Design a protein around this ligand. Structure first.
Ligand SMILES: Cc1cc2nc3c(=O)[nH]c(=O)nc-3n(C[C@H](O)[C@H](O)[C@H](O)COP(=O)(O)OP(=O)(O)OC[C@H]3O[C@@H](n4cnc5c(N)ncnc54)[C@H](O)[C@@H]3O)c2cc1C
Ligand SMILES: Cc1cc2nc3c(=O)[nH]c(=O)nc-3n(C[C@H](O)[C@H](O)[C@H](O)COP(=O)(O)OP(=O)(O)OC[C@H]3O[C@@H](n4cnc5c(N)ncnc54)[C@H](O)[C@@H]3O)c2cc1C
Ligand SMILES: NC(=O)C1=CN([C@@H]2O[C@H](COP(=O)(O)OP(=O)(O)OC[C@H]3O[C@@H](n4cnc5c(N)ncnc54)[C@H](OP(=O)(O)O)[C@@H]3O)[C@@H](O)[C@H]2O)C=CC1
Ligand SMILES: NC(=O)C1=CN([C@@H]2O[C@H](COP(=O)(O)OP(=O)(O)OC[C@H]3O[C@@H](n4cnc5c(N)ncnc54)[C@H](OP(=O)(O)O)[C@@H]3O)[C@@H](O)[C@H]2O)C=CC1
Ligand code: HEB
Ligand code: HEB
Ligand code: HEB
Ligand code: HEB
Ligand SMILES: CCCCCCCCCCCC
Ligand SMILES: CCCCCCCCCCCC
Ligand SMILES: CCCCCCCCCC
Ligand SMILES: CCCCCCCCCC
Ligand SMILES: [Zn+2]
Lengths: 446, 446
């Protein structure tokens, strides 16, 4: 009852700020035009609201500033993965407000009847109706990913008509417009792009495609970083982000596990289900993860489906762990040296809570790989523990965090340092169960 | 004749752009006021010039954007270490222009005689004369580092008076003013600062102080990064940058070799010459240096005095090299393993050209340390070669780059990859002598 409200404590606050700014502008422009009777008042209010929307709807779509903002506490508080579907909501309110604006001014013109404004307004109305119609989900559900882009590129014409349609619109558009164009000028053909080539595409079960793309000769990424994959064979101008699910110590390839959860990522699987093709990835982005390897007995916890970076992190952890098992050639002596300058872990736990393994079968097979690779060493010491709960049937059902944390605190391998990747409700439950045992809780953005 | 002009090909271009913008504004405001006779014309021209200067003189002093700009090709083209002494030049031209402005308007008032403008102008003139007098070099040459800061903080009053003195000045000040205040609001008490404490201060010969400051528990820097040291015992509000001269693999301390080349860095040596005191360093900044360790037979070259980061780079190189000499406990077998995931070098050359070893005696002793540490291994293989030329008397005299590069190309340890740290004249000579041998030349910013 309060956990559901706790997850959306930020989306609700952003929507409340939005509706509050709209009611503020509406009432403000309805007070300053009270003498005009009920038809220019509504129309001028909606005019101010349009001035705001048609201008900031573009500062939402800054996928160059979103990457930098998505690494910080600013991302910890307000959601930035919802920017596409907050932008769609700003588009829907632009359409509704412009409709009531047109209707208000039409009724006003009729009352006055009992060349910039009206003709440029008919032009704006036709353009916004075209963007509305040719920006629905049916345009991209069918394999028309280039009709959407072109017929939705008319926001330039919308802004152009809107400059010499609204007298004071340019003042609004100046800041978000210049920011949008400066970001479009920062990112060009080979700004950060790298024309990589798929070495192979496996089709894992339950509609998830595994892309082994060539690693560009100089590509350095921390474990847990993502990249904006682009495949002109699926969609020419779409750049979708995906977490790299391979440890950086893997020098030959870059893995990407792409789950069929949309209309592009689904088009990928549908096209390869019916390889060396073109791709243009865009850089590694992500939060620094040195807090995990410069730790002791890290307890990684992951809920839901945002645990693709935990695959990369666990693979890197086990790579660095196996990289400190030395064997002498002469006398075959096999010793283990100390924690050395990259990883300081003596133990690692990985607790994965989920509803099921619907799309995460590759994840379970990868964890099985790691557990079996290090399990033949488990007679003297265990380094990676894997708990995988399912909550819908591996120990079925939710954890009992009191018991789990008490067992973690039973054996002492150092200063336990919990890390979390999930919902803020479970984050509250975790910090509550965690401050009792003195574990240094964390929560990663990814 | 053309090398001297080649070094200053960017300072001369910046000064030419500056003088051109001034002559543009002067002539533009002298054309639009041609009817007013010779006294309001000059005064309004100088007014426009002041509007530009008094506004952008502050965008020069953005030591928060300068760190980000100093890592890129944008820093490769235009100089950013001259921002302090370009700012001083903007201050001198502000004073000269305001003097001729005052004189022009005084002669105009006299011609008209044969309450904002004039009184606020007397106030601006007195404030600018105070900043001019109490911002000379004599204020900080004596140990008055706090009189300078306070009596030079009156640029706030100068801007305040200038808003309601010039009608259109606020339009100019809006962008640099908001940028300056946003940068001052980004950096607060503990934004990136770390209240470190000096563990020790050695006084090396020839007026250079070696600060072994405690390494804050979580401080990660690449080899070759700098930090903005601050010592409230020398100067309370001054933040001078210094390159860290210790390899990151040194976990206990952070070294800083501070040469007495000014009035603060000199005050440091003079005060300690006549330890646990307060310091507040500000983060690691610098260009990525992975190109040196992910290389083969890197030929580092350093000219002049900007080779403090080469001390850190060489110490890190030799640390990582000695970190791959394994010895088995049982049979005492001592083997060397392969290039492993951090450093790929099989050889390193370090060619240091300078005029003399005036302040760089610590550097020569450090290179002697490294050469002697690895020289007892030189019977089977040499990893670090050290050439140190002096050009004023170690092989005295300039190198013969044809011979040096031919000797480098004689022995084949991989794909030679020259790196350079020096003047653009020597950079031209190097790229010329380097494209002949197919060495992949580089030039670092630091
Ligand atoms: C850092 C990061 C890493 C991700 N890694 C993966 C991964 O490895 N595998 C995976 O299957 N999914 C991953 N996603 C989520 C998502 O499935 C993909 O990022 C991709 O954007 C989906 O595109 P789509 O066309 O299939 O979605 P659509 O069908 O276009 O839309 C469906 C959903 O995807 C969202 N969406 C649409 N376009 C984008 C976009 N450009 N960026 C982000 N969200 C978008 C919509 O808001 C909606 O919620 C990741 C998301 C982020 C932020
Ligand atoms: C990245 C970097 C690393 C440096 N590392 C070292 C180092 O390890 N040892 C060393 O002796 N010097 C170093 N310097 C140069 C310089 O000596 C110091 O940075 C310091 O700023 C000098 O201050 P000062 O008060 O002695 O100079 P001043 O007496 O105030 O001025 C003399 C000269 O220093 C310049 N200067 C003044 N204040 C600054 C400032 N805040 N930042 C930069 N330049 C300034 C002036 O333009 C002038 O050319 C470095 C410079 C940079 C950019
Ligand atoms: N900034 C934001 O606003 C963010 C929002 N989210 C939220 O993520 C949610 C995703 O849905 P979902 O992933 O189901 O939410 P959860 O993250 O709560 O579900 C994740 C897993 O946690 C399990 N779980 C829930 N409560 C407990 C508990 N008390 N003890 C142990 N395990 C528990 C669930 O099992 P069961 O489902 O069986 O209870 C589920 O398998 C969205 O509602 C979204 O709002 C995600 C990231 C940040
Ligand atoms: N962005 C910019 O504008 C930058 C400017 N600089 C320039 O750095 C200069 C510093 O003075 P300085 O350091 O003396 O200039 P140099 O860097 O040219 O002097 C560095 C060393 O190189 C040696 N040297 C010069 N020419 C040759 C050559 N042809 N072959 C071999 N060795 C050579 C010099 O020896 P000798 O002195 O005995 O000839 C000197 O010891 C300043 O003039 C400044 O303009 C520095 C960085 C960037
Ligand atoms: C984009 C969306 C849109 C649309 C569709 C529209 C449509 C329209 N419209 Fe508009 N508008 C607008 C947006 C718009 N619009 C704006 C923004 C403005 C401004 C406001 C103010 O007031 O400010 C206007 C404004 C306006 C005005 C006022 C004038 C000026 O400029 O000042 C008028 C009259 C109008 C009309 C109109 C009409 C008739 C129409 C239909 C045809 N308009
Ligand atoms: C005028 C204004 C505007 C408007 C109204 C709109 C409206 C809209 N919209 Fe928009 N968009 C925009 C402007 C806009 N828009 C922009 C600017 C962008 C960006 C593009 C790029 O980035 O290039 C977008 C983008 C976008 C996107 C992205 C693409 C991808 O996928 O990646 C999407 C999905 C959208 C949707 C939408 C919708 C649904 C709507 C409703 C109709 N859009
Ligand atoms: C800061 C430096 C400075 C200074 C010192 C000055 C000083 C002066 N001044 Fe000055 N101004 C100025 C800066 C200045 N200034 C400016 C910036 C301006 C504006 C320009 C225009 O025209 O725009 C002026 C402006 C001005 C004017 C015009 C008016 C208006 O506002 O419009 C006048 C009359 C004056 C006067 C004067 C005088 C009498 C003096 C002495 C006492 N002037
Ligand atoms: C009004 C305007 C102005 C003016 C006129 C000036 C003028 C001047 N200036 Fe200044 N500055 C300034 C504004 C200014 N300024 C600023 C804003 C700054 C910054 C500060 C801080 O950062 O805090 C400076 C800063 C500054 C500095 C830095 C400090 C250190 O050391 O670190 C110096 C050195 C200077 C000098 C100068 C001179 C010499 C002059 C001539 C008088 N300058
Ligand atoms: C449908 C709910 C959408 C909620 C959007 C939250 C605010 C996103 C801000 C993104 C800023 C770039
Ligand atoms: C005395 C010569 C000064 C030359 C200044 C060059 C331009 C510096 C630009 C700094 C921009 C932040
Ligand atoms: C300006 C009017 C804003 C209305 C916002 C409504 C949001 C509904 C989210 C479901
Ligand atoms: C606006 C007048 C600018 C004059 C610049 C002079 C620069 C001299 C550098 C030595
Ligand atoms: Zn042995």
């Amino acid at each position: 009852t309060r956990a559901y409200w706790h997850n959306h404590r930020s989306q609700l606050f952003c929507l409340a700020t939005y509706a509050g700014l709209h009611v503020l502008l509406f009432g403000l422009a309805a007070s300053a035009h009270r003498d005009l009777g009920a038809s220019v008042m509504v129309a001028k209010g909606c005019g101010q609201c349009l001035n705001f929307d048609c201008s900031f709807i573009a500062v939402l779509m800054l996928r160059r500033c979103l990457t930098w903002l998505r690494a910080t506490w600013l991302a910890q508080v307000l959601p930035l993965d919802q920017n596409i579907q907050f932008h769609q909501l700003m588009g829907y309110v632009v359409v509704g407000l412009s409709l009531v604006h047109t209707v208000a001014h039409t009724v006003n013109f009729v009352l006055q009847a009992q060349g910039s404004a009206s003709p440029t307004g008919v032009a704006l109305l036709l353009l916004l109706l075209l963007m509305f119609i040719c920006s629905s989900s049916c345009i991209r559900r069918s394999g028309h990913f280039e009709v959407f882009y072109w017929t939705h590129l008319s926001y330039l014409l919308v802004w152009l008509l809107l400059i010499f349609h609204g007298p004071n619109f340019w003042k609004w558009l100046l800041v978000p417009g210049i920011l949008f164009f400066l970001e479009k000028a920062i990112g060009l053909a080979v700004s950060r792009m790298a024309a990589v080539c798929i070495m192979e595409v496996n089709l894992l079960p339950s509609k998830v495609t595994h892309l082994l793309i060539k690693r560009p000769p100089f590509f350095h990424y921390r474990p847990g970083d993502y990249l904006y994959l682009n495949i002109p064979t699926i969609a020419r101008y779409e750049w979708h982000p995906f977490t790299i699910s391979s440890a950086p110590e893997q020098k030959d390839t870059i893995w990407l596990h792409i789950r069929s959860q949309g209309q592009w990522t689904n088009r990928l699987y549908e096209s390869f289900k019916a390889c060396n093709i073109k791709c243009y990835i865009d850089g590694p982005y992500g939060t620094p993860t040195r807090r995990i390897f410069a730790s002791e007995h890290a307890v990684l916890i992951g809920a839901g489906i945002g645990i693709t970076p935990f695959a990369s992190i666990l693979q890197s952890i086990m790579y660095r762990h196996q990289k400190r098992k030395h064997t002498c050639p002469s006398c075959q002596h096999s010793w283990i040296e100390g924690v050395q300058d990259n990883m300081k872990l003596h133990k690692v736990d990985f607790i994965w809570i989920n509803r099921d393994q619907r799309s995460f079968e590759w994840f379970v097979s990868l964890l099985t790989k790691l557990e079996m690779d290090q399990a033949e060493e488990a007679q003297y010491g265990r380094f990676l523990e894997l708990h995988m709960y399912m909550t819908s049937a591996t120990q079925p059902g939710r954890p009992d965090w009191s018991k789990v944390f008490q067992k973690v605190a039973a054996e002492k391998k150092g200063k336990v340092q919990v890390f979390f990747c999930g919902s803020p409700a479970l984050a509250k439950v975790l910090k509550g169960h965690c401050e009792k045992f003195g574990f240094r809780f964390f929560q990663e953005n990814f």
